[PDB]
Amino acid sequence: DFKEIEIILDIIKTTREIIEDNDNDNEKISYHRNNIRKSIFFLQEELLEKYSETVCKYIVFPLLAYVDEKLMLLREKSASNISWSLLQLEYYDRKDGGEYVFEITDNILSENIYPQICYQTISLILHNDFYGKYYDNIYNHSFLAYKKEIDKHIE
């Protein structure tokens, strides 16, 4: 089953709401960042009961990277001068998640059969327009391969 996917969907949902919204001050964004941080901890808690560290990483990191990408987009477009500190820096001291999502994805596809939740999580971020290093090239053949390939792992 999963209380996990319910948390993941909710993180995704609330993020999409933030971008769609016309006016956010830094207050609201901040409030949103902290709610995601609360959720991540419950997400990790639920994961570490059943799964390896590496598997939690494979699931949490892409989620953080999804959120950072979209908030970084909003922050750039935004009239208001809103600020965003990278979650992927906060949890993992790296900022190259535009790439790292795809190394995780490649591992998930090449290196083993991991629990289904790893495939679902990448799938979900991709079905929500996470581009990472392909932001300029939506039709990059590797990028399209990733989409087709992870989806062939789910029901």
> Which of the ranges 18-26, 73-81, 86-94, 147-155 carries the binding residues for Au ion, by CB under 5 A?
147-155
For the chain, the distance separating the N- and C-terminal CA atoms, rounded to the nearest angstrom, is: 14
Q: How far is the CB of 23 from Au ion (least distance, A)?
A: 28
Closest CA to 29 of 69, 63, 74: 74
**Residue 27: CA count within 13 A, CB half-sphere:** 2
Q: How far is the CB of 87 from Au ion (least distance, A)?
A: 14
153 token code pair? 């792992």
Q: How far is the CB of 40 from Au ion (least distance, A)?
A: 9
Over the window 38 to 77, marking each residue x when it contacts Au ion by CB under 5 A and - when it does not, the resulting string is ------x---x-------x---------------------
Distance CA 92, CA 79 (A): 30
Distance of CA 67 to the CA centre of its chain: 6
Distance CA 130, CA 30 (A): 21
The answer to whether 34 and 28 have CB atoms below 8 angstroms apart is: no
Q: How far is the CB of 53 from Au ion (least distance, A)?
A: 6
> Which of the ranges 24-32, 76-84, 98-106, 124-132 carries the binding residues for Au ion, by CB under 5 A?
124-132
Of 94 and 127, CB closest to Au ion = 127
> Which of the ranges 1-9, 12-20, 21-29, 145-153 carries the binding residues for Au ion, by CB under 5 A?
145-153
Q: Which residues bind Au ion (CB under 5 A)?
A: 44, 48, 56, 109, 127, 153
